[PDB]
Amino acid sequence: ASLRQQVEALQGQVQHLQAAFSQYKKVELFPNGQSVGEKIFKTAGFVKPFTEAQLLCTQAGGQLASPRSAAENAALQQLVVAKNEAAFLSMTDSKTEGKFTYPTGESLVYSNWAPGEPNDDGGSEDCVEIFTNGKWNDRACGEKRLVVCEF
Amino acid sequence: ASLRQQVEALQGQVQHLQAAFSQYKKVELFPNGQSVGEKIFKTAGFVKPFTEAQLLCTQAGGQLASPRSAAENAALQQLVVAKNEAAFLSMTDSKTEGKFTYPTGESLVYSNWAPGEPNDDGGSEDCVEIFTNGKWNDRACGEKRLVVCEF
Amino acid sequence: ASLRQQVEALQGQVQHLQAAFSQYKKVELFPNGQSVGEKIFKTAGFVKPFTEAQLLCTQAGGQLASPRSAAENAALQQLVVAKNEAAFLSMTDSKTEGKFTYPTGESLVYSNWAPGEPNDDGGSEDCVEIFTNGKWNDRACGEKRLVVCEF
Numbered sequence: 129a130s131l132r133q134q135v136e137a138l139q140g141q142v143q144h145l146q147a148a149f150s151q152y153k154k155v156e157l158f159p160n161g162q163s164v165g166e167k168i169f170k171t172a173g174f175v176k177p178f179t180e181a182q183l184l185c186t187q188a189g190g191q192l193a194s195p196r197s198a199a200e201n202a203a204l205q206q207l208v209v210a211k212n213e214a215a216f217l218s219m220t221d222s223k224t225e226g227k228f229t230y231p232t233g234e235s236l237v238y239s240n241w242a243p244g245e246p247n248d249d250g251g252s253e254d255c256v257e258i259f260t261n262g263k264w265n266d267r268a269c270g271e272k273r274l275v276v277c278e279f
Numbered sequence: 280a281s282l283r284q285q286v287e288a289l290q291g292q293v294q295h296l297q298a299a300f301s302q303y304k305k306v307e308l309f310p311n312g313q314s315v316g317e318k319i320f321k322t323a324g325f326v327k328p329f330t331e332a333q334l335l336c337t338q339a340g341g342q343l344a345s346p347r348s349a350a351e352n353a354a355l356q357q358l359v360v361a362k363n364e365a366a367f368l369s370m371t372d373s374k375t376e377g378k379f380t381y382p383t384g385e386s387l388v389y390s391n392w393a394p395g396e397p398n399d400d401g402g403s404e405d406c407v408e409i410f411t412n413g414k415w416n417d418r419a420c421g422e423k424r425l426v427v428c429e430f
Numbered sequence: 431a432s433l434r435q436q437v438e439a440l441q442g443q444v445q446h447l448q449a450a451f452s453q454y455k456k457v458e459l460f461p462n463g464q465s466v467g468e469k470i471f472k473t474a475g476f477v478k479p480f481t482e483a484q485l486l487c488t489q490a491g492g493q494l495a496s497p498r499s500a501a502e503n504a505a506l507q508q509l510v511v512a513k514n515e516a517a518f519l520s521m522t523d524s525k526t527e528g529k530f531t532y533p534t535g536e537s538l539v540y541s542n543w544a545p546g547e548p549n550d551d552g553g554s555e556d557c558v559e560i561f562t563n564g565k566w567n568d569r570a571c572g573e574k575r576l577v578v579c580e581f
């Protein structure tokens with residue numbers, strides 16, 4: 129009997145937490161975050177070469193932005209447009225030229241390559257950048273692009 | 280009766296969440312947010328013209344800062360002072376000159392105008408900025424001011 | 431006794447909340463915060479003299495970074511390195527020259543002084559800064575250093 133009362137009490141505490149937290153979710157994502165589905169993109173707000181950008185995301189418990197649908201790509205694009213800086217995606221073809229994969233090693237399930245890309249320009253573009261127009265282009269990993277991680 | 284040991288686990292989970300959530304709130308608000316009552320003000324840390332600022336807040340799930348009491352205005356003022364950048368409020372008299380209203384449409388229920396304001400200087404001041412001193416002044420919507428949203 | 435089904439329900443809500451909270455926490459800390467044990471360090475991203483930095487942290491419900499172990503120091507070093515700006519710690523020897531203490535008055539339980547430090551150079555170094563290499567140096571409280579608070 130006391131348990132039924134203890135349960136109701138917990139119900140009230142949970143409802144409170146749920147409500148308060150929903151508000152802080154909005155506050156937190158402003159202005160550098162974007163929620164799409166169960167994924168959250170967040171930009172560090174600055175540019176870094178691929179290797180450094182990758183380390184920043186992984187050490188933070190996430191990974192570089194990896195849009196796997198038109199919906200996610202559009203969400204990521206909003207951050208890129210807002211910062212007016214193209215960003216690096218997580219995928220590369222460093223292992224096998226022409227074969228882009230996620231950090232897991234799996235093949236792409238979605239892509240939004242600009243016409244003619246990837247073209248491995250100069251024979252040395254193994255990373256991927258997303259333009260403010262939302263399209264993808266393979267680019268030199270040594271370049272510095274906006275750091276956007278996904279969680 | 281095993282339900283009793285399960286309730287005990289739940290109680291522990293909720294207390295842990297209450298403690299973690301409270302700590303997280305302080306972290307989030309530092310150093311660009313202010314909690315006042317049920318409202319939360321948060322600055323984007325940069326400036327933008329009115330239209331742009333308004334869009335940013337709306338798309339983020341909130342709206343431009345709309346202080347409705349001396350208490351809210353003081354909370355907002357802290358952010359303005361910290362950043363040393365005057366900010367736009369959500370209110371405007373763009374529809375009917377001389378009559379400032381909220382994004383919703385209702386008339387002002389609180390105001391903290393500087394002496395002599397609003398004066399529609401140049402016959403073209405329909406937006407509202409709040410100075411580091413906390414006072415309000417009607418200013419051209421085309422000017423760039425600190426973006427501060429409320430949630 | 432559908433209380434067993436009622437407990438099942440809350441079990442699900444609490445776990446759903448635990449998952450969302452864990453995700454938003456990681457997002458929150460990227461890229462200006464660092465979690466170590468139950469402590470959370472977060473930098474404001476800018477510099478301020480000691481008194482102003484201390485006030486910012488206290489007003490935020492926390493205090494200046496106070497590394498109490500090699501683990502916490504390394505965590506704080508990450509933020510300093512990321513911003514490439516030495517930061518102030520909370521400890522000072524203002525009360526009794528030579529004896530550094532925490533805001534509570536307790537003497538240090540951990541230190542990471544650089545060789546030759548602390549030296550009270552010039553006869554007036556009562557604050558402490560942590561370099562990008564993680565070592566400490568007593569420095570004039572009037573200098574402006576990175577603001578990092580702990581919650």
Ligand SMILES: OC[C@H]1O[C@H](O[C@H]2[C@H](O)[C@@H](O)[C@@H](O[C@H]3[C@H](O)[C@@H](O)[C@H](O)O[C@@H]3CO)O[C@@H]2CO)[C@H](O)[C@@H](O)[C@@H]1O
Nearest residue numbers: 214245246247248249253259260261262265266267268
């Ligand atoms: O530098 C190596 C890359 O060089 C070429 O890329 C050019 C595009 O050809 C050029 O049009 C422009 O791309 C912009 C695109 O037209 C625009 O719609 C979008 O919003 O932003 C893009 C980025 O500014 O500039 C890029 C170079 O930055 C080449 O096509 C590409 O394959 C090479 O990797």
Ligand SMILES: OC[C@H]1O[C@H](O[C@H]2[C@H](O)[C@@H](O)[C@@H](O[C@H]3[C@H](O)[C@@H](O)[C@H](O)O[C@@H]3CO)O[C@@H]2CO)[C@H](O)[C@@H](O)[C@@H]1O
Nearest residue numbers: 365396397398399400404410411412413416417418419
């Ligand atoms: O530019 C159009 C506005 O021009 C006039 O505003 C001036 C004030 O007259 C001037 O004193 C100064 O206001 C500052 C105020 O005195 C100070 O206490 C506060 O902390 O900051 C204010 C902003 O710097 O500058 C403003 C212009 O920015 C005119 O009075 C106003 O109605 C016109 O809209």
Ligand SMILES: OC[C@H]1O[C@H](O[C@H]2[C@H](O)[C@@H](O)[C@@H](O[C@H]3[C@H](O)[C@@H](O)[C@H](O)O[C@@H]3CO)O[C@@H]2CO)[C@H](O)[C@@H](O)[C@@H]1O
Nearest residue numbers: 516546547549550551555561562563564567568569570
């Ligand atoms: O200004 C008062 C301090 O002056 C002296 O400090 C110097 C060091 O002597 C100098 O080597 C350099 O320290 C750097 C340290 O060698 C390096 O490993 C670390 O990553 O960064 C340090 C800071 O750039 O600069 C400091 C001054 O900033 C004096 O030794 C010290 O006791 C005085 O307080």
Ligand SMILES: [Ca+2]
Nearest residue numbers: 221222225254
């Ligand atoms: Ca290659």
Ligand SMILES: [Ca+2]
Nearest residue numbers: 221248253254
């Ligand atoms: Ca390639």
Ligand SMILES: [Ca+2]
Nearest residue numbers: 247249265266
């Ligand atoms: Ca290319």
Ligand SMILES: [Ca+2]
Nearest residue numbers: 372373376405
């Ligand atoms: Ca008008």
Ligand SMILES: [Ca+2]
Nearest residue numbers: 372399404405
């Ligand atoms: Ca007007």
Ligand SMILES: [Ca+2]
Nearest residue numbers: 398399416417
């Ligand atoms: Ca005016």
Ligand SMILES: [Ca+2]
Nearest residue numbers: 527554555556
């Ligand atoms: Ca002294």
Ligand SMILES: [Ca+2]
Nearest residue numbers: 523550555556
């Ligand atoms: Ca001293």
Ligand SMILES: [Ca+2]
Nearest residue numbers: 549551567568
């Ligand atoms: Ca010294």
